[PDB]
Write an enzyme that holds these catalytic residues in place. Structure first.
Site, PDB file in Angstrom:
ATOM      1  N   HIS A 221      17.916 -20.990  16.291  1.00  0.00           N
ATOM      2  CA  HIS A 221      18.073 -21.536  17.411  1.00  0.00           C
ATOM      3  C   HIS A 221      19.196 -20.862  18.141  1.00  0.00           C
ATOM      4  CE1 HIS A 221      19.120 -24.336  20.111  1.00  0.00           C
ATOM      5  NE2 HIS A 221      20.163 -25.002  19.771  1.00  0.00           N
TER       6      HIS A 221
ATOM      7  N   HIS B 251      32.941 -13.482  24.114  1.00  0.00           N
ATOM      8  CA  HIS B 251      33.051 -14.643  26.009  1.00  0.00           C
ATOM      9  C   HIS B 251      32.653 -13.451  27.272  1.00  0.00           C
ATOM     10  CE1 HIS B 251      34.920 -17.722  28.019  1.00  0.00           C
ATOM     11  NE2 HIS B 251      34.976 -16.868  29.171  1.00  0.00           N
TER      12      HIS B 251
ATOM     13  N   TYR C 256      30.093 -15.957  29.922  1.00  0.00           N
ATOM     14  CA  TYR C 256      30.062 -15.233  31.100  1.00  0.00           C
ATOM     15  C   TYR C 256      28.413 -14.797  31.772  1.00  0.00           C
ATOM     16  CZ  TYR C 256      34.458 -17.660  31.262  1.00  0.00           C
ATOM     17  OH  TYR C 256      35.414 -18.242  31.268  1.00  0.00           O
TER      18      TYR C 256
ATOM     19  N   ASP D 232      11.243  -0.915  45.389  1.00  0.00           N
ATOM     20  CA  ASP D 232      10.612  -1.344  43.272  1.00  0.00           C
ATOM     21  C   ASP D 232      12.647  -0.800  42.858  1.00  0.00           C
ATOM     22  OD1 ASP D 232       9.978  -0.997  40.536  1.00  0.00           O
ATOM     23  OD2 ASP D 232       8.361  -0.596  42.094  1.00  0.00           O
TER      24      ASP D 232
ATOM     25  N   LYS E 245      35.467 -21.742  43.337  1.00  0.00           N
ATOM     26  CA  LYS E 245      33.113 -21.347  43.188  1.00  0.00           C
ATOM     27  C   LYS E 245      33.012 -22.796  43.725  1.00  0.00           C
ATOM     28  CE  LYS E 245      30.558 -18.779  42.751  1.00  0.00           C
ATOM     29  NZ  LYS E 245      30.019 -18.069  41.701  1.00  0.00           N
TER      30      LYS E 245
ATOM     31  N   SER F  33      23.698 -21.512  43.877  1.00  0.00           N
ATOM     32  CA  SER F  33      23.936 -21.016  44.864  1.00  0.00           C
ATOM     33  C   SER F  33      22.877 -20.762  46.740  1.00  0.00           C
ATOM     34  CB  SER F  33      25.334 -20.407  45.150  1.00  0.00           C
ATOM     35  OG  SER F  33      25.421 -19.312  46.497  1.00  0.00           O
TER      36      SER F  33
ATOM     37  N   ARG G 263      30.648 -28.068  12.272  1.00  0.00           N
ATOM     38  CA  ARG G 263      29.414 -27.892  12.839  1.00  0.00           C
ATOM     39  C   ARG G 263      28.681 -27.223  11.383  1.00  0.00           C
ATOM     40  NH1 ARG G 263      30.813 -23.808  17.614  1.00  0.00           N
ATOM     41  NH2 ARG G 263      29.491 -22.154  16.721  1.00  0.00           N
TER      42      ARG G 263
ATOM     43  N   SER H 234      17.838  -2.667  24.904  1.00  0.00           N
ATOM     44  CA  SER H 234      17.371  -3.320  26.132  1.00  0.00           C
ATOM     45  C   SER H 234      17.587  -3.950  27.341  1.00  0.00           C
ATOM     46  CB  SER H 234      16.225  -4.439  25.562  1.00  0.00           C
ATOM     47  OG  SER H 234      16.273  -5.465  26.473  1.00  0.00           O
ATOM     48  N   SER H 235      19.239  -4.625  26.672  1.00  0.00           N
ATOM     49  CA  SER H 235      20.275  -5.069  28.188  1.00  0.00           C
ATOM     50  C   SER H 235      21.091  -4.043  28.423  1.00  0.00           C
ATOM     51  CB  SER H 235      21.143  -6.390  27.251  1.00  0.00           C
ATOM     52  OG  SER H 235      20.092  -7.431  26.870  1.00  0.00           O
TER      53      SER H 235
ATOM     54  N   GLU I 174      29.689 -12.278  27.320  1.00  0.00           N
ATOM     55  CA  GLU I 174      28.202 -12.686  26.853  1.00  0.00           C
ATOM     56  C   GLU I 174      27.947 -14.293  27.076  1.00  0.00           C
ATOM     57  OE1 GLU I 174      25.503 -10.751  25.737  1.00  0.00           O
ATOM     58  OE2 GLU I 174      24.996 -11.821  26.639  1.00  0.00           O
TER      59      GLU I 174
ATOM     60  N   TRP J 108      25.152 -18.107  15.303  1.00  0.00           N
ATOM     61  CA  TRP J 108      24.865 -17.208  15.545  1.00  0.00           C
ATOM     62  C   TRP J 108      26.269 -15.462  15.667  1.00  0.00           C
ATOM     63  CZ3 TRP J 108      27.593 -17.718  21.697  1.00  0.00           C
ATOM     64  CH2 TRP J 108      27.462 -16.844  21.869  1.00  0.00           C
TER      65      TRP J 108
ATOM     66  N   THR K 243      36.491 -20.226  38.919  1.00  0.00           N
ATOM     67  CA  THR K 243      35.837 -20.928  39.135  1.00  0.00           C
ATOM     68  C   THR K 243      35.761 -22.563  39.481  1.00  0.00           C
ATOM     69  OG1 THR K 243      35.409 -20.147  36.694  1.00  0.00           O
ATOM     70  CG2 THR K 243      33.809 -21.881  37.623  1.00  0.00           C
TER      71      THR K 243
ATOM     72  N   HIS L  47      40.077 -16.996  22.524  1.00  0.00           N
ATOM     73  CA  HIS L  47      40.025 -18.647  22.713  1.00  0.00           C
ATOM     74  C   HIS L  47      39.031 -19.181  21.641  1.00  0.00           C
ATOM     75  CE1 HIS L  47      36.990 -17.688  25.971  1.00  0.00           C
ATOM     76  NE2 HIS L  47      36.712 -18.776  25.098  1.00  0.00           N
ATOM     77  N   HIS L  48      38.280 -18.456  20.885  1.00  0.00           N
ATOM     78  CA  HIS L  48      37.436 -18.600  19.930  1.00  0.00           C
ATOM     79  C   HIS L  48      38.752 -18.464  18.458  1.00  0.00           C
ATOM     80  CE1 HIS L  48      34.059 -18.982  22.672  1.00  0.00           C
ATOM     81  NE2 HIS L  48      35.174 -17.672  23.416  1.00  0.00           N
TER      82      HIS L  48
END
Ligand SMILES: CCCCCCCCCCCCCCCCCC(=O)OCC(COC(=O)CCCCCCCCCCCCCCCCC)OC(=O)CCCCCCCCCCCCCCCCC
Ligand code: HEA
Ligand code: HEA
Ligand SMILES: CCCCCCCCCCCCCCCCCC(=O)OC[C@H](COP(=O)([O-])OCC[N+](C)(C)C)OC(=O)CCCCCCCCCCCCCCCCC
Ligand SMILES: CCCCCCCCCCCCCCCCCC(=O)OC[C@H](COP(=O)(O)OCCN)OC(=O)CCCCCCCCCCCCCCCCC
Ligand SMILES: CCCCCCCCCCCCCCCCCC(=O)OC[C@H](COP(=O)(O)OCCN)OC(=O)CCCCCCCCCCCCCCCCC
Ligand SMILES: CCCCCCCCCCCCCCCCCC(=O)OC[C@H](COP(=O)(O)OCCN)OC(=O)CCCCCCCCCCCCCCCCC
Ligand SMILES: CCCCCCCCCCCCCCCCCC(=O)OC[C@H](COP(=O)(O)OCCN)OC(=O)CCCCCCCCCCCCCCCCC
Ligand SMILES: CCCCCCCCCCCCCCCCCC(=O)OC[C@H](COP(=O)(O)OCCN)OC(=O)CCCCCCCCCCCCCCCCC
Ligand SMILES: CCCCCCCCCCCCCCCCCC(=O)OC[C@H](COP(=O)(O)OCCN)OC(=O)CCCCCCCCCCCCCCCCC
Ligand SMILES: [Cu+2]
Ligand SMILES: [Mg+2]
Ligand code: NA
EC number: 7.1.1.9
Lengths: 49, 139, 104, 71, 57, 44, 514, 227, 47
Positions: free
Chosen positions: G61, G240, G244, G91, G319, G255, G438, G156-157, G242, G126, G316, G290-291
């Site tokens: 998942h 983190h 973002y 292109d 924003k 926006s 979890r 790929s990324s 990722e 994950w 943020t 923070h994790h």
């Protein structure tokens, strides 16, 4: 009458309301799923060993 | 082809006056209407005025800011398909879910309540604070 | 950004004699973009310009958009029409309330 | 003869009075949560730990023969 | 060694319809069929080995 | 964004088929597996 | 013709088409995995038996929904459609590695499917935290298949990020200042930069783990002087940035749809928008622990990380207030894209504030890896990024295919999925505050009621997925065309036809001299 | 022990939990402030009718829109550092208890004198004796004294675990080769229930924590009565 | 020109037959939603 939502809008309103409340009451009450109600006030504590 | 490149007619309160008229073709009656438009300003009457407005602009402000019933069609459709979801839930209790664990029996629930009242589980405000320990009832 | 010179530059841009349809529409649209119900002098100059440019529909669209820009409070449009009382019967222009587009 | 109403900054005045309204209803919601559950929880702690006796609580837990430390 | 760039610069600007990955001649077409025949054959052989790992005897 | 009229307008029956069509084969697989999990469970 | 155009594609429009198809397929797979998880979590008891298979389901998942749905949908897909049409490029800069990255994605998904096939399974989550993913707890190949799928998706990324950065800062018209592009280009630029700086980090971490298992090394083995805390540090220095990545094109899309359907010719505070984007990009790399508030770090390090997390919280908020300001003053056309944008604004606000409640460090010492975190990232991701994907999807669909969407049915989809995700994701506040962790296949009696409510809402969201796929069919079957598009003067993508042809911008744009 | 229809936290037993919940409802009144504010702003511009699509002035409101949320975040962050200092305070270790998370269970060690190590297993649903709680009960409880700051040295044997008792207010990851120190205090005796919170194999949901705290005299009576 | 362009012509699948399109979308999304359920049944058979 000319647009689709003039009278059929009220028809879908009434049908959705009745359908929703009837099926939600059916699934909440008459099937037999338990919500695990809060035991305060409604159940007296039977003695355990 | 060219419709996207050319300026197009549109109606909103943001952009009240589009570059192009509502109609592009001009009939003989509309050409005579434009001739009388070029004619005297105090000699053109109500129906010529309203058809001139109709051929220049498609939808007027008062007939495009109206509150139409699509929103109630939305909420009715949402209630319909949430009812279908409730049907899926009826099926999903009837078929995939088998027996439930025996700890949820009414006598077992009552004895569990008595045990965690004897332990005084979180008894400041959560669960055991609402039970009278002297009168053997709740509050 | 003073209001009186704002009004003066708008009225002189509207009553410039060689005004054209494209620049009239541009001026009306970018004045509608402002958070400002237009001055009846500005609307008067716009009606004079639509008199020079021969457009009933543009004139009554200016009247309808100042009606829309009046907002929830309705008292603006009787006010502006009672200042534009002489020019509406001088130019032969009919109010959208008279010519029936407020109702459907 | 109608007089001249507000013609300049209508949405500006509406925005000013409505952000004042936003601030007052935001402090109203915060104070609603506060006066509803924040200090009543503190008063619950104060009552419990003013009237609390640990040995009495342990003995009334122990009276039914539950802990294996004390049988 | 000799500068053979301009003569190979004439064999690739010919607007003969072949794409840029095939103008060089029959060697390139043979090599492109070769890299098709082992990539797709390898991929088909890869998913068979994964399925054989998925299903024991 | 104004839209041109549907080249192939769907009839009441067409919408009915469309909605059910997928629901049917987009939940049928799910139902089969979930409904028989207990059998599948049998190591047999 | 088919194998020449689609399997060997070299144009960004069809590349984004195949991105959209793969993202829809991955959304289907992730939806099925979520429904199976909620089938565990709608009634107490072992519906499947062991929870190792349930951990496989939640791992699939997470992986399928993050790496194969959201990034190929908005970063690959919407970027590849939009940013050449946004900046006037004919292109992409390197369409050949663009096609390589695309066709790299289905091997990653196939390797993850093979991982699910292998009887050991990917029972890790994950997070692939050793020594759970080592040779002792997982004596199999499934976690190796997951690591190699991460390799495929990572390269790929990286290739897509290089192509996107090159296209953005190279082939804008030469008289354009870089501070003059539309904000989706800026969002995907910062996204590609952070991809470029964070994807070699996953590469290092998962090569470390792969070498730890297969080559008898001790990088995270406690019996050889290694430590899993190093993997946690590397994986969250990935993690983190990722998330973002998974939120920044959401910022850009919301926006753009707000400034489109709100009637404004420009969003409020463009400099503030771009500054906030670069600020959260810059601070996304120094808040990775923070994790890590419960792992056992130094306490001053924890204080610094929570303070810097407040420092990432502030821009943020700048924003969000700029979004409210550009909503202010404009007539609201009630397209479903505004409905998605408003849902994004409110639900992203409450999700980010839930993230702040987590971000207080001792609140993670009480609240780490509970369902409070689940509520946080499902608010800010499972309907933040999802609602942004929906907004862009229902916005640019007349541009993508040429067929419009009917507002009544589209809003019906919006309303049902909004109700479903709210009913799904609002009880886990109580589930986490009441204190269940979890990755559980069965829950205690206190959590039974809210778990049942969440599963019922998840089935509502499933019905919404059905009405969405029916709606895609209905659009493609009714085939009503686009008469006209407003705001094409400001939005460059909409003026080149709906849909734009195969060869766009063969004549470059005449940019003003100033 | 969590009760059905629970919306907040399990009620405090430790003073550290008391300040956690005080700061928790401080953060809740802050988030409710911001949520109500953004709700009223959204409702304001969806309920309005006037239009302004002219050049909007940008460099006037970002100053307050930067400085006042900075005040909100710093008044959020200051009690966080205060509570962190409370965990940074010195200890009075009357006892040292070590937890060792084994594969799908726990082992608890009291080693200050007369080393004893016991195994916290999982009780099954069918073997639950009548009246208990499901998925929580352990045949061998973990015995502590009340009102005493006790060291908790937490590690694990072969896989990562996470010792987490939410009622008392402790949660630290059991890492092999890295034992964390947690200060356990309370104010009441009795049973306290928690879980494992890190994924650790095929019985991750089946590792609970039960802690019974009673008067010191009963604690050494227990410790003498086992051996 | 070299490739055919137009509304519905930039898709890899045919659009003209709505029932064939319904069949292919049905089997596509059905395989997508059915892959994890066949994973869980395959693992249940394996275990
Ligand atoms: C050209 C002339 C016709 C040639 C035969 C077409 C049918 C067979 C085929 O090879 O068909 C081509 C293939 C192409 O599929 C792929 O390439 C899959 C890549 C993964 O189609 C499939 O297999 C099935 C696709 C079903 C429809 C999916 C709709 C998804 C909607 C959501 C995205 C909208 C984007 C709008 C934009
Ligand atoms: C979309 C992806 C996304 C985004 C944007 C975020 C954004 C944030 N995340 Fe989160 N996060 C995840 C995805 C994301 N996260 C995932 C996927 C996990 C778990 C992964 C795993 O466990 O496997 C996670 C986990 C996670 C944890 C772990 C908790 C634990 O396990 O102990 C924490 C705690 O600090 C956290 C914090 C934050 C913070 C503080 C933000 C902030 O960036 C949010 C900022 C947004 C706001 C909207 C700020 C609020 C501002 C306003 C409302 C303006 C007004 C304010 C004032 C007036 C003061 N995240
Ligand atoms: C993109 C990321 C994403 C998304 C959308 C979701 C969506 C959902 N998640 Fe997910 N979830 C995660 C990422 C995501 N989750 C992660 C990263 C974890 C942690 C894993 C771990 O513990 O290790 C997690 C964990 C997680 C758990 C914890 C399992 C456990 O700990 O026991 C649960 C259970 O309730 C859950 C439930 C759900 C539900 C009910 C949805 C529903 O919202 C599903 C509905 C949403 C959609 C269907 C998305 C929309 C997409 C489409 C409609 C298809 C796209 C196609 C087109 C647009 C054409 N999630
Ligand atoms: C996909 C591959 C299916 C392979 C297979 O054996 O399918 C049989 C399975 C059926 O096997 P099954 O084991 O799921 O169910 C058999 C049930 N009885 C014994 C009552 C007949 O086919 C399907 O599930 C059909 C799915 C259609 C969509
Ligand atoms: C429990 C939650 C249920 C949510 C259901 C949402 C349904 C939304 C329906 C919708 O947007 O309808 C469009 C309609 C405006 O369109 P129109 O009818 O032209 O305007 C008349 C004004 N009532 O009405 C609206 O736009 C009003 C509803 C807007 C909801 C925004 C939610 C943001 C969060
Ligand atoms: C006395 C000062 C005080 O602490 O007031 C409580 C509250 C303001 O709280 P404050 O510490 O300013 O924090 C910002 C908002 N949470 O004060 C408020 O929120 C406002 C209190 C006055 C108005 C109450 C209205 C109640 C309506 C029902
Ligand atoms: C029962 C499922 C099939 C319902 C078929 C049906 O009633 O079709 C009529 C209508 C067609 O859609 P229509 O409302 O014309 O389009 C939106 C206009 N803006 O579609 C509907 O009214 C859909 C009603 C779905 C009810 C569930
Ligand atoms: C319509 C509902 C049909 C239904 O629920 O059928 C019952 C059946 C239960 O399956 P069972 O009795 O175990 O035996 C399989 C027989 N083919 O159910 C099934 O086999 C699942 C059918 C799901 C159909 C969804 C449409
Ligand atoms: C790992 C896979 C590496 C694949 C690779 O390097 O391919 C060569 C790549 C594609 O060549 P490219 O320049 O895109 O050609 C079309 C536009 N001229 O070449 C390039 O993209 C040029 C070099 C870019 C830097 C990254 C190389 C990796
Ligand atoms: C949505 C808003 C943003 C997210 C908030 C999540 C936190 C939350 O709502 O927690 C529930 C909160 C506290 O619950 P509490 O009443 O303290 O429970 C203890 C015994 N009554 O309870 C409340 O705040 C009141 C009930 C929920 C209101 C929403
Ligand atoms: Cu993070
Ligand atoms: Mg972990
Ligand atoms: Na279950």
């Amino acid at each position: 009458a000319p647009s689709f939502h003039d009278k059929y809008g009220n028809a879908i309103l009434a049908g959705g309301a009745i359908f929703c409340v009837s099926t939600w009451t059916y699934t909440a009450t008459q099937i037999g799923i338990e919500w695990n109600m809060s035991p305060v006030g409604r159940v007296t504590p039977k003695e355990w060993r | 082809s060219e419709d996207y490149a050319f300026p197009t007619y549109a109606d909103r309160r943001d952009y009240p006056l589009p570059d192009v008229a509502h109609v592009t073709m001009l009939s003989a009656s509309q050409k005579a209407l434009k001739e009388k438009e070029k004619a005297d300003w105090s000699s053109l009457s109500r129906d010529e005025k309203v058809q001139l407005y109709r051929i220049q602009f498609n939808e007027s402000f008062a007939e495009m800011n109206r509150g139409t019933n699509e929103w109630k069609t939305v909420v009715g459709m949402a209630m319909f398909f949430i009812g279908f979801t409730a049907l899926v839930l009826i099926w999903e209790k009837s078929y995939v879910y088998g027996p439930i664990p025996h700890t949820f029996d009414r006598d077992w629930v009552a004895m569990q309540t008595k045990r965690m009242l004897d332990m005084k589980a979180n008894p400041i405000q959560g669960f055991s604070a609402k039970w009278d320990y002297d009168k053997n009832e709740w509050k | 950004e003073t209001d009186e010179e704002f009004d003066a530059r708008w009225v002189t841009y509207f009553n410039k004699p060689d005004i054209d349809a494209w620049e009239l529409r541009k001026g009306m649209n970018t004045l509608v973009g402002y958070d400002l119900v237009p001055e009846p002098k500005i609307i008067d100059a716009a009606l004079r310009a639509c008199r020079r440019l021969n457009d009933f529909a543009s004139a009554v669209r200016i009247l309808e958009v100042v009606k829309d820009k009046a907002g929830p409070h309705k008292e603006i449009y009787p006010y502006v029409i009672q200042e534009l009382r002489p020019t509406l019967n001088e130019l032969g222009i009919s109010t959208p309330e008279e010519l029936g587009l407020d109702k459907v | 003869l109608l007089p001249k109403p507000q013609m300049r900054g209508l949405l500006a005045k509406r925005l000013r009075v409505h952000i004042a309204g936003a601030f007052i209803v935001a402090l109203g919601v915060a104070a609603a949560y506060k006066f509803g559950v924040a200090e009543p929880r503190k008063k619950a702690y104060a009552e419990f730990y003013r009237n609390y006796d640990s040995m009495k609580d342990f003995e009334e837990m122990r009276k039914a023969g539950i802990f294996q430390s004390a049988k | 060694f000799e500068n053979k760039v301009p003569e190979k610069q004439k064999l690739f600007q010919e607007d003969n319809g072949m794409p840029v990955h095939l103008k060089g001649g029959a060697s390139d077409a043979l090599l492109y069929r070769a890299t098709m025949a082992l990539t797709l054959g390898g991929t088909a052989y890869a998913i068979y080995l994964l399925a054989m790992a998925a299903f024991p005897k | 964004v104004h839209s041109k009229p549907a080249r192939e307008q769907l009839g009441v029956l067409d919408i009915t088929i469309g909605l059910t069509s997928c629901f049917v084969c987009c939940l049928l697989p799910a139902g089969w597996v979930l409904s028989h999990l207990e059998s599948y469970k049998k190591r047999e | 013709m088919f194998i020449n155009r689609w399997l060997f594609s070299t144009n960004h429009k069809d590349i984004g088409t195949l991105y959209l198809l793969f993202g829809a397929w991955a959304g289907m797979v992730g939806t099925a995995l979520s429904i199976l998880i909620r089938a565990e979590l709608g009634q107490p008891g072992a519906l499947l038996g062991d929870d190792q298979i349930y951990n496989v389901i939640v791992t699939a998942h997470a992986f399928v929904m993050i790496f194969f749905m959201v990034m190929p949908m908005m970063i690959g897909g919407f970027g590849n459609w939009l940013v050449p049409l946004m900046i006037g490029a004919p292109d992409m800069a390197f369409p050949r590695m663009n096609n390589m990255s695309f066709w790299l994605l289905p091997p990653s998904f196939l390797l993850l499917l093979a991982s699910s096939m292998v009887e050991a399974g990917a029972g890790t989550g994950w997070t692939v935290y050793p020594p759970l993913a080592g040779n002792l707890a997982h004596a199999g190949a499934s976690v190796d298949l997951t690591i190699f799928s991460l390799h495929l998706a990572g390269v790929s990324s990286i290739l897509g990020a290089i192509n996107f950065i090159t296209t953005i800062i190279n082939m804008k018209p030469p008289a354009m200042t870089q501070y003059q592009t539309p904000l989706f280009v800026w969002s995907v630029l910062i996204t590609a930069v952070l991809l470029l700086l964070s994807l070699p980090v996953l590469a290092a971490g998962i090569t470390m783990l792969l070498t730890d298992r297969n080559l008898n090394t001790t990088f995270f083995d406690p019996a050889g002087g290694g430590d899993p805390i190093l993997y946690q540090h590397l994986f969250w220095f990935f993690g983190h940035p990722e998330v973002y990545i998974l939120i920044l094109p959401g910022f850009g899309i919301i926006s753009h749809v707000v400034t489109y359907y709100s009637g404004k010719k420009e969003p409020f505070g463009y400099m503030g928008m771009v500054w906030a984007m670069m600020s959260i990009g810059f601070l996304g790399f120094i808040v990775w622990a923070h994790h890590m508030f419960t792992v056992g770090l130094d306490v001053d390090t924890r204080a610094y990380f929570t303070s810097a997390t407040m420092i990432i919280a502030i821009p943020t908020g700048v924003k969000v207030f700029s979004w409210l300001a550009t909503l202010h003053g404009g007539n609201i056309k009630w397209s479903p894209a505004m409905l998605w944008a408003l849902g994004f604004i409110f639900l992203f606000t409450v999700g980010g504030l839930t993230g702040i409640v987590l971000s207080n460090s001792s609140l993670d010492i009480v609240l780490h890896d509970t369902y409070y975190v689940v509520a946080h990232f499902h608010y800010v991701l499972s309907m933040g990024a999802v609602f942004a994907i929906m907004a862009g999807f229902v916005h640019w669909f007349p541009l993508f295919s040429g067929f419009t969407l009917d507002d009544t049915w589209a809003k019906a989809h919006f309303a049902i999925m909004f109700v479903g995700v709210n009913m799904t994701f609002f009880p886990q506040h109580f589930l986490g505050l009441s204190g269940m962790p979890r990755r559980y296949s069965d829950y205690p009696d206190a959590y039974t009621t809210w778990n049942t409510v969440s599963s019922m809402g998840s089935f509502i969201s499933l019905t919404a997925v059905l009405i969405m796929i029916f709606m895609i069919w209905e659009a493609f079957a009714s085939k009503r065309e686009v008469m006209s598009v407003s705001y094409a003067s400001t939005n460059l993508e909409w003026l080149h036809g709906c849909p734009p042809p195969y060869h766009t911008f063969e004549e470059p744009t005449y940019v003003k001299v100033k | 022990m969590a009760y059905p229809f629970q919306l907040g936290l399990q009620d405090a037993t430790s003073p550290i939990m008391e300040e956690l919940m005080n700061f928790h409802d401080h953060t809740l009144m802050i988030v409710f402030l911001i949520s109500s504010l953004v709700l009223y702003i959204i409702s304001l511009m969806l309920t309005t009718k006037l239009t302004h699509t002219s050049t909007m002035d940008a460099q006037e409101v970002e100053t307050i829109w930067t400085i006042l949320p900075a005040v909100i975040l710093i008044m959020i962050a200051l009690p966080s550092l205060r509570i962190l200092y409370m965990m940074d305070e010195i200890n009075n270790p009357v006892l040292t208890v070590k937890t060792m998370g084994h594969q799908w269970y726990w082992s608890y060690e009291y080693t200050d004198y007369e080393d004893l190590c016991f195994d916290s297993y999982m009780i099954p649903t069918n073997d639950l004796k009548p009246g208990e709680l499901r998925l929580l009960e352990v045949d061998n409880r973990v015995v502590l004294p009340m009102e005493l700051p006790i060291r908790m040295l937490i590690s694990s044997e072969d896989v990562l675990h996470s010792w987490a008792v939410p009622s008392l207010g402790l949660k630290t990851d059991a890492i092999p080769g890295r034992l964390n120190q947690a200060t356990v205090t309370s104010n009441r005796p009795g049973l306290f229930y928690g879980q494992c919170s890190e994924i650790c194999g095929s019985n991750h949901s089946f590792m609970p924590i039960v802690l019974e705290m009673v008067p010191l005299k009963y604690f050494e009576n227990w410790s003498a009565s086992m051996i | 020109s070299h490739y055919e362009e137009g509304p519905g012509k930039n898709l890899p699948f045919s659009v003209e037959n709505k029932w064939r399109l319904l069949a292919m979308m049905t089997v596509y999304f059905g395989s997508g939603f059915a892959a994890p359920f066949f994973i869980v049944r395959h693992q249940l058979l394996k275990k």
